[PDB]
């Protein structure tokens, strides 16, 4: 008669690593790395992202005519933008401090666009002739929808003195611009005056823009340049414009309302008609694992990203052959 | 393994013991079979569960990458930004992979320890009463019946 | 007769954590986290901090009239500045590269202010009329004490040609400014000349400032703007000014002497009349613990900051019930 | 615990032994009492002291936050700056908390080890001379007087 | 050490055993000498080799400093840059130094473990056949010749 | 008769550290830290570095006359530059966005210099008189070799209209400059016109430089200043210049060919006539150790840098006395 001490074995095939030994077969193990996503861009927590597709944040905010899909967009959870969007800056130029703006946007879930200076508000200036074949809409020379390309009337550009006051309680993103012609005669044809300026002031802004003439390459069949500037106008603050030409004046500006958690994802993926609690630029994650190896940039309640191919904890004992 | 029981003096585990992690096989005139030692098994289930939760939890505060964009003449800070994000992701990957490696080795040894402690607990009781066979087994000098066997398991021999 | 092996127990109640078990009662333990401070701002190693209170680093350096407390301050150990100090930039504007200056200050313990251009040195310009109700002192329109608001004399602003040479062996912080009026007639009233400039040169500086006119919000009852610039003038180097108006000229500049280890702390706390070897923005630390959890930003011989609520090492054995 | 002595086959510690960490209780006709084993206790005091100093010291070079300020149009680098400082403070917090967890577990096991090694050292000497009771105690076949007891402690039995 | 064999009940090592890490000394009428236990030694050589490679390898992805330059009015980002590079170099230095400390201690204990397991394997076989001397040695009740000795080593006594 | 279990000792003196004990003598140990270098700068993987010695990256690229050693340099593995090179910016000034350029260079192994505007291409301007005693060559006033200091001809500076097209398939580093005179009459003497500009455009560049007059310290016996700008001109893109004076025009520009892995090392060491697989600013590394403690900045197949004085793993057991 005989009694023995012993331990469990089973048919388990699961292996874990240790410092001294690799691929130790164990009776039980817990995998803690999520390796799977659904390869789709999905609504986050019910709330649909803003998917620009072709349009850039610039093409969207300035109101590129091909970006009409985004004239008025609802509260979004996150923004998706391609690597090299086609519909941005239709008329070539620059967007001043663009990245600082993109950054401001990452802490914003909802914009509400309101008219600040009406197009039919320019008594002394031609406001329906500021168009270009660089920005076509339905086959016809058009222009950025939210700004107005002011042009000479009866052969005069009177000094503009316009001023908007932010009576709204919500911060306001005001955008404007300046046109840089390519020679002396273009200045004459468009604005009459040969030397000009746009001065812009708020309680904290002290700006004076002066057009730079230079001969340059035809980007989009254009040698002229537009340069766009922005500010954030506080509540109870006023923005004062003064210009005698080259002025791209605000028509609309965005009230900043929601101020949500958010990111701009870079992805060449289109909307996937799904919902998730954790989204990556490659696809969404539905998992209870502590870690995942999908992509570093995520939004939501997410597992921690690591670079591993494999994370498995032993729970049972060395399984015997 | 450090404690010499698992795949040590106890050559291999028991497919026939589904009841728990460690226990006894008995064999006498009335028959034979397996019986999981409930408390050492439970102590082990607690240990491993707490460990996993400690492990998961310790790792919950951990570097989150934030998308950040730079223009064409901001290459130095873009690179700094990149080297920073990658740098933390490498530190955490290493932290995670190593913690797993070390604790896996500690878990396996823990099981070995629990088997050895159980073995010794039984060895202590048997005394001159049984021959210690060398293989995990004790062969009785006299005639152990099922309640004799039960008495060993329960901890009240002699 | 009987002999037993055994181990210590005691009445200890101290508990430590392990991976597999939490709150293990042990016979002895060493706490290594300092959780306590004195909630005061104290002298460091005998040496009192510069506590601006209301004044900002700007309000202090330019010589805001309400910042007379700081006309001449001794060697300090560290600087304390509130989150939103009231006494800074009394006359609204900007302080050029302010943060790079703040940064330079973090490696500085002592300034010694010396006169570089005497107020009673302006033969051709009115130098006692450059005042504002934005900067009051004892009820009367006054101005930044260290700079001089030069103004037209007998209806003329002759081109200024002034130049200071740094004969001192210590680096010199020279500060100056430019006034940006809000319309054409203000320029006329103050300086006579309608188009102006301030040119500034050293061995490494090549500056030319030109006033920006714009109509803007009344910050401190003022639409005008001041913009302040600084340089560090090496030994045996000269600073050359040239201006025909809008010039805010140096009177005083600071010799940089001590060059100590230092920081600007953000704190709404006032001086506490104590001494310490390690100061945080929340209070001081007197401890021999290796770690503390008080605040990340410290100065002195300090423990290492961690985010923990608890760090306790077992030294003894599992205490038995 | 891994070595099975502390709160293992030795059910609990001794309030009555203030002399040191491990030792003996003896009980014969002349009376009874406790005697700390001075050298195993000293070995343990050394081990733990060195460990703490190693632990403190290894942690002395460690990220120091430097106050750094940014204007209204420097938000990207301000955030980078913040994410960097926080990132290191999280790495070090984790480093510190884990080191404590792991070493606490190693310290407790070390004490268990020292008790077991002491137990075995005595077991080796007693031989067939005493009955190993299972509980930490050895019951002598014959008559152990105080210098007989002392001889066990001192390491010179038989 | 944790397992009590090395510099424990086995007072010191054997200059005369160059053959391997652990083994036997025998001594009878025909003479005496050393014989390395080939398999426990090999198990140990594997363990330590794998460990070193694990250690080297785990450390192969690790922060690389990139030279980066800043002008006179970029002092804040220069310092950030510096604090970042230093910060990672300190994290990795600590990671490396600690891993070495902990694993060194684990390696030494591993050897102790292997010696103790070998000791116990022999103890199990000898039974009442030999007197366990306390020092690592077993003194036979009867007359062990060279093939008797060989039988112990080979694992087939009695 | 007697059999004993036991373990190895030997004559080993090698010690390792543990948490609980320092300097444990062990039978065997593996050192894993490389402590040695050869103190030389060496060819990397056969490929010699560009060792500027005295010259700076600026002195090299602009073509400082004392930097003739580097008129045409082969593919390099890495660049070495002293802390304070003497031969840079012989005529005092600035190099615009110099660090962003240095950074671009770190991902470049080969430049090939080609003529874009010929010196004997200026019909209306004097192109052999733009020299200075600040930039001497063989004892005579000379100038940066790759740019041309255009100067008035027969007492006229006609508006320059020059334009180069990048027909090459390789990106092109184009460099130019502007001269800032120190007074009104110097402008007259050099260029005739009193108010000038240089306008520069590409498909993405929109520049207009205007000379800044100021009186300043004689760095290199000079109060004038040069300011240098650069661009990267894409394939099939054109660069358009327009200027009526103060223009430092391209003669040569560099084709960017190789685009190799690379760094600029700071070192006061000269070439050592050796080859290596891993170079540091202090010397080269030949080792199979996983770690080294030499210097953080390396290039090649290198061990990982740590700050340790000692890294030794136990492999054997505690060696007995």
Author numbering:
A (entry chain E), C (entry chain E), F (entry chain E): 5 to 325
B (entry chain F), D (entry chain F), E (entry chain F): 1 to 158
Task: Copy text verbatim from the article accompanying this structure deposition.
The complexes of wild type and Glu186Asp mutant HAs with LSTc showed similar features and indicate only weak binding. In both structures, there was clear electron density for only Sia-1, the 2-6-linkage atoms, and two or three additional atoms of Gal-2.
